[PDB]
């Protein structure tokens, strides 16, 4: 549960890459800084889960990079515990009980998700999520649904709002998503 935080220099190839993807829908926001979260436990759980997904879903590209807006209050919890069950309790439920990730930063940048702190600062993560093989989510899914309702040994990895034109993804467990970068920004 130990972690380090490293601020990225605006001059760093890594900074450019992250800002570039943030600015595809959020260029009208001012970036205050970008930190890399380094949580060795959360990382090793994630890489291990990625290895077994790659052995299992054949040609599927299991890894996506998605945005997660949140309040300042949640940042320490997430940097430590990841996107775990207690955190999942604080998310919406319309597409299932888990943590919600947007394809486009400007979804996450809504004030409902990345609530502005007393100084007007907004917080959005650029998360590695193992979306793997996914299906339409709904409110009743409080665990990953089975492909076959008669066989719970074949589970979907995540759920989405729309399988063929997805806007968001719900992940159920902490080993499925790594909060790699935290973007602090303002209007
Ligand atoms: O990025 C996002 N972060 C969060 C966490 S919000 C919460 C954190 C704890 N403190 C209070 C604020 N939720 C989202 C929900 C989305 N869509 C759902 C809206 C209703 C149906 C689908 C899309 C998103 F991009 C996000
Ligand atoms: Cl797996
Ligand atoms: Cl799973």
Swiss-Prot record:
It is found in: Nucleus; Cytoplasm. Residues 1-187 form the PARP catalytic domain. Expressed in macrophages. It comes from the Eukaryota. Auto-ADP-ribosylated. Induction: Up-regulated by IFNG in macrophages. Down-regulated by IL4 in macrophages. Interacts with STAT6. Interacts with PARP10. Interacts with PARP9 in IFNG-stimulated macrophages; the interaction prevents PARP14-mediated STAT1 and STAT6 ADP-riboslylation. Belongs to the ARTD/PARP family. ADP-ribosyltransferase that mediates mono-ADP-ribosylation of glutamate residues on target proteins. In contrast to PARP1 and PARP2, it is not able to mediate poly-ADP-ribosylation. Has been shown to catalyze the mono-ADP-ribosylation of STAT1 at 'Glu-657' and 'Glu-705', thus decreasing STAT1 phosphorylation which negatively regulates pro-inflammatory cytokine production in macrophages in response to IFNG stimulation. This is Protein mono-ADP-ribosyltransferase PARP14. It comes from Homo sapiens (Human). The gene is PARP14.
């Amino acid at each position: 549960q130990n972690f380090c935080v490293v601020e990225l220099l605006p001059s760093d190839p890594e900074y450019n890459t992250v800002a570039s993807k943030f600015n595809q829908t959020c260029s009208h926001f001012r970036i205050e800084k970008i930190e890399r979260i380094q949580n060795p436990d959360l990382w090793n759980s994630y890489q291990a889960k990625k290895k077994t997904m790659d052995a299992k879903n054949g040609q599927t590209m299991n890894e996506k990079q998605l945005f997660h807006g949140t309040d300042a209050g949640s940042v320490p919890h997430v940097n430590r515990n990841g996107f775990n069950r207690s955190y999942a309790g604080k998310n919406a439920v319309a597409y299932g009980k888990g943590t919600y990730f947007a394809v486009n930063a400007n979804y996450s940048a809504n004030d409902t998700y990345s609530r502005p702190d007393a100084n007007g600062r907004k917080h959005v993560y650029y998360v590695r999520v193992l979306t793997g093989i996914y299906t339409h989510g709904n409110h009743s899914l409080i665990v990953p649904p089975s492909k076959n309702p008669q066989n719970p040994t074949d589970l979907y990895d995540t759920v989405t709002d729309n399988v063929h034109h997805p806007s968001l993804f719900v992940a159920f467990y902490d080993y499925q998503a790594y909060p790699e970068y935290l973007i602090t920004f303002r209007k």
